[PDB]
Design an enzyme around this catalytic site. Structure first.
Site, PDB file in Angstrom:
ATOM      1  N   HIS A  81      37.273  33.717  43.507  1.00  0.00           N
ATOM      2  CA  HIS A  81      36.678  34.920  43.987  1.00  0.00           C
ATOM      3  C   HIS A  81      34.969  34.348  44.215  1.00  0.00           C
ATOM      4  O   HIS A  81      34.286  35.277  44.621  1.00  0.00           O
ATOM      5  CB  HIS A  81      36.300  35.741  42.695  1.00  0.00           C
ATOM      6  CG  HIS A  81      37.448  36.664  42.391  1.00  0.00           C
ATOM      7  ND1 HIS A  81      38.102  37.463  43.261  1.00  0.00           N
ATOM      8  CD2 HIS A  81      38.445  36.924  41.438  1.00  0.00           C
ATOM      9  CE1 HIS A  81      39.314  37.947  43.078  1.00  0.00           C
ATOM     10  NE2 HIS A  81      39.279  37.830  41.838  1.00  0.00           N
ATOM     11  N   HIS A  94      44.930  39.132  43.023  1.00  0.00           N
ATOM     12  CA  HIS A  94      43.822  39.581  43.532  1.00  0.00           C
ATOM     13  C   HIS A  94      43.406  38.858  44.875  1.00  0.00           C
ATOM     14  O   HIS A  94      43.705  37.753  45.011  1.00  0.00           O
ATOM     15  CB  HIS A  94      42.608  39.570  42.765  1.00  0.00           C
ATOM     16  CG  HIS A  94      42.798  40.200  41.235  1.00  0.00           C
ATOM     17  ND1 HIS A  94      43.476  39.597  40.159  1.00  0.00           N
ATOM     18  CD2 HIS A  94      42.415  41.554  41.195  1.00  0.00           C
ATOM     19  CE1 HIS A  94      43.691  40.297  39.176  1.00  0.00           C
ATOM     20  NE2 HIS A  94      42.800  41.557  39.476  1.00  0.00           N
TER      21      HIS A  94
HETATM   22  N1  LIG Z   1      37.294  42.485  35.682  1.00  0.00           N
HETATM   23  C1  LIG Z   1      38.337  42.940  36.787  1.00  0.00           C
HETATM   24  C2  LIG Z   1      39.194  41.619  37.153  1.00  0.00           C
HETATM   25  C3  LIG Z   1      38.428  40.424  38.183  1.00  0.00           C
HETATM   26  C4  LIG Z   1      39.358  39.431  38.750  1.00  0.00           C
HETATM   27  C5  LIG Z   1      40.349  38.960  37.948  1.00  0.00           C
HETATM   28  C6  LIG Z   1      41.391  37.966  38.414  1.00  0.00           C
HETATM   29  O1  LIG Z   1      42.585  37.730  37.841  1.00  0.00           O
HETATM   30  N2  LIG Z   1      41.393  37.452  39.912  1.00  0.00           N
HETATM   31  O2  LIG Z   1      42.355  36.652  40.259  1.00  0.00           O
HETATM   32  K   LIG Z   2      45.767  36.698  46.498  1.00  0.00           K
HETATM   33 ZN   LIG Z   3      43.836  37.460  39.751  1.00  0.00          ZN
END
Ligand SMILES: NCCCCCC(=O)NO
Ligand SMILES: [K+]
Ligand SMILES: [Zn+2]
Ligand SMILES: NCCCCCC(=O)NO
Ligand SMILES: [K+]
Ligand SMILES: [K+]
Ligand SMILES: [K+]
Ligand SMILES: [Mg+2]
Ligand SMILES: [Mg+2]
Ligand SMILES: [Zn+2]
Lengths: 343, 345
Positions: free
Chosen positions: A160, A198
C-alpha cells in the site's frame, strides 16, 4: 526446498491501537502473524531459514523519496517531543481543494505523508520497516544468486505504500523494492503480481509510468473495500506505462473457482510480457475466514495457487503482505510455498 | 446599545463523545456548554432580544454546498450504524496524494471523500444540529436585511472550515458563507467575510476563491504550525476573477492584540477599498490568551476593542459564532465583542 528470510526485529513494530469503526482496537497486523507463519515453516521443514542482511537505505531510496524516509526515521521522536500522549496517528490531511504542500508541524507532516489513520506509529516502527525491506532484499539476493524462489516473510507489509505515502499497515513497499533491485542488477523486465485481497495501490503508483515493470493486482472491489480510491479496472497506466498495469476486481463471496479465472488472465498477461523476474506480493486475506475480507478461498486452494505460480517458470520472490486469521495464516502461506514446490 | 441574538436549542443534538486528538479518543473540545454559556452571558448582560431561527429549507444551504454533500450528511450516521460499526462515525481512509478523487460506494470511502480530518465525529443529531446552525445564520441575515444594523448568530456547530463538499475542524455547513450568499441572492452587490477566529477559514476561502463579488479575509495562526495546515498561506490571493479577492494574514505563536490588531487594521483597509454592501464576521474567541488549543494572547477587554473597531466599518454586519474553547470565559469574550460593537467599550 524453499528458503525463508525472517527477521526477529519485526517484533519492534508493536503498536497497541488501530483506528477502526470509530474505535481504537487491537491492530489486526500483530506480530503473532509472522511468528505463526515461521512456526509452520519450521514444522513443515520447508527449507533453510535465514536472517536478512543489512543493505542500508540505498536500495530503499530507489523507490521512496529521501524526505519520506527521513520522516519515517524522525516521526515518533517528533511526535513525543510535540507533547502528544497517544501513538502517532494522522488527524488532518490534504482534503480535496487544499494544497499538497509539506508543512512544518508533525501533525501536518503525518497527514501529508499518509493515506489513512489505521497505521499507528510508535517506537521501533522505523527499525521494523527497515528490517522488512531488508528481508525482501535478501530474498531477492538469494534468487539472483541461484535459488529458483525465496520466501520473504516480511512484517510489516508493503504493497500500500507509495513513494512517499504510508497507510494500510504499510511503510516501505517491500515488493517494489525487490523488483527495483532486480532491475538494478540487470534484469530487463520484472513482473509484480499482487494476490493479496486488497489492491496493491503503492506498487501500481510507483511503476505507473514505466513499462519495464508490469504491475498486476487481483483484489476486492475498491468501491466496497480499502483502498477505495485506486484499484479500478480502468487504471491501465500512463505515459510509457500505458497498458503495463492491470487491475482485476471481484465482488463479495468470490470463491477460488472464479478468482482463479482472474489469476489465469494475470498469468497469460505475464507470459506475453515475458519478464526476467517475478515478485508475488502474497496475502492470505483471500481466506474464507479472514476477519476483514470477503473472499472464500480454502486452505487447499493456496496449494493450488502455489502450483499455478510455479508453472510460470520464473525466478520468484514472495513478499508477505496481509492475512489476519492467525489460526490458519501459517497453514495458508506455507501452503502457497509447498504448492510451489510440488506438494 | 442593543443587538439581537439567534439561538436554537437543537444545537444540543450535536453531542459526540469522542474526538481524535494526539492519538487518543478524548472528550470533544466543541461541547454544548460553549453555546449554553454564551447564551447565559447574553441573558445576564441583557444584550437584546433572543429568538429561535426560522426553517429556510435546503435551498439556501445548496446555494453553497453540493447536493451530494448535503445528502451524504443526512444519511451518514444511518449508513454507519447499518454497516455494523460500533463507534461514532470517523473517517479512517482518504484520497492520499497520488490517488483518484472518485466517490466510492462504501460508507468509509464516502466519509474519506467528504472530509479533511478525523477530529470531527458524526453521530445521531449531527445532521439536525448542522441544519439548525445554518438556519441560525440565515435568520440573523434576515434580521439584518429587514432593518437591523447587526445580529449575532449563536451558531453551533461552527462552519468556517466546511468546503462546498468537505467537512472537518468541527464544521459541517459553512454558516458564514451561507449568510454571505443569502445577502448576494437578495440583491447585495458585494459582501465581505472577515474571519477573526484563530484558525484559517479555509472553507470560506475555497467557496468564493474564483469570485470577486465576495471578498474573503482571514487572520489566523500560521498553518505551517496549526490546523488546517494545507491552506491559509499568505500567497493564496484567489484565482481567475477572484485574484486579489482573498487575503490571508498569518501570525506566529504568542502574538498579542497589539500586533494582531495591525493585521486587523490591514483587513479593515482592504474592506474599505472593497466597499462591500454587507459584512459577515466569522467570530472565534480562540484567539484568547487561555484557549487550550491555540497560541494567541488576546485578553477579554481586547474583544471589546475588536467589536468597536468592527462597528467603525459602518456596515450591516452578521456575526457567526465559530471557535473558542475556554468555556469559563467564552461568554464574556463573545458577548464582549457584541457589546463593544454596540459601544460598551
Ligand atoms: N484498516 C483497513 C485495512 C487496510 C489494508 C490491510 C491489508 O491487508 N492490505 O493488504
Ligand atoms: K491484490
Ligand atoms: Zn490485504
Ligand atoms: N482538532 C483540531 C482543531 C480544529 C478546530 C479549529 C477551529 O476552532 N476553527 O474555528
Ligand atoms: K507499470
Ligand atoms: K481566521
Ligand atoms: K473571493
Ligand atoms: Mg499539531
Ligand atoms: Mg468499509
Ligand atoms: Zn478556530
Amino acid at each position: 526446498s524453499m528458503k525463508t528470510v525472517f527477521s526477529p526485529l519485526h517484533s519492534r513494530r508493536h503498536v497497541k491501537t488501530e483506528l477502526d469503526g470509530g474505535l481504537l482496537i487491537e491492530p489486526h497486523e500483530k506480530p503473532s502473524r509472522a511468528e505463526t507463519i515461521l512456526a509452520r515453516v519450521k514444522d513443515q521443514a520447508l527449507g533453510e531459514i535465514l536472517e536478512p542482511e543489512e543493505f542500508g537505505l540505498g536500495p530503499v531510496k530507489r523507490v521512496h523519496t529521501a524526505d519520506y524516509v527521513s520522516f519515517l526515521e524522525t516521526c515518533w521522536d517528533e511526535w513525543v517531543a510535540a507533547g502528544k500522549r497517544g501513538e502517532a496517528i494522522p488527524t488532518f490531511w490534504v482534503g480535496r481543494g487544499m494544497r499538497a504542500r509539506l508543512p512544518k508541524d508533525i501533525d501536518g507532516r503525518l497527514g501529508y505523508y499518509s493515506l489513512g489513520a489505521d497505521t499507528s506509529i510508535s517506537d521501533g516502527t522505523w527499525e521494523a520497516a527497515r528490517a522488512s525491506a531488508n528481508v525482501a532484499l535478501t530474498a531477492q539476493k538469494l534468487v539472483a544468486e541461484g535459488e529458483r524462489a525465496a520466501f520473504a516473510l516480511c512484517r510489516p507489509p508493503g504493497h500500500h505504500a507509495h513513494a512517499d505515502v504510508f497507510g494500510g499497515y504499510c511503510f516501505f513497499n517491500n515488493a517494489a523494492i525487490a523488483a527495483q533491485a532486480f532491475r538494478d542488477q540487470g534484469y530487463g523486465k520484472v513482473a509484480v503480481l499482487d494476490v493479496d485481497f486488497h489492491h496493491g495501490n503503492g506498487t501500481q503508483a510507483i511503476f505507473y509510468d514505466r513499462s519495464d515493470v508490469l504491475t498486476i493486482s487481483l483484489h476486492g472491489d475498491p468501491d466496497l473495500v480499502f483502498p477505495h480510491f485506486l484499484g479500478f479496472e480502468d487504471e491501465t497506466g500512463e505515459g510509457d506505462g500505458e497498458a503495463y498495469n492491470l487491475n482485476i476486481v471481484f465482488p463479495p463471496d468470490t470463491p477460488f473457482s472464479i478468482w482463479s479465472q482472474g489469476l489465469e488472465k494475470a498469468c497469460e498477461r505475464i507470459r506475453t510480457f515475458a519478464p526476467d523476474a517475478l515478485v508475488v506480493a502474497l496475502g492470505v486475506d483471500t481466506f474464507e475466514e479472514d476477519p476483514i475480507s470477503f473472499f472464500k478461498l480454502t486452505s487447499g486452494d493456496y496449494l493450488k495457487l502455489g502450483k499455478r505460480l510455479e508453472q510460470l517458470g520464473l525466478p520468484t520472490v514472495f513478499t508477505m503482505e496481509g492475512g489476519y486469521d492467525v489460526d490458519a495464516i501459517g497453514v495458508n502461506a506455507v501452503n502457497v510455498m509447498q504448492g510451489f514446490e510440488g506438494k
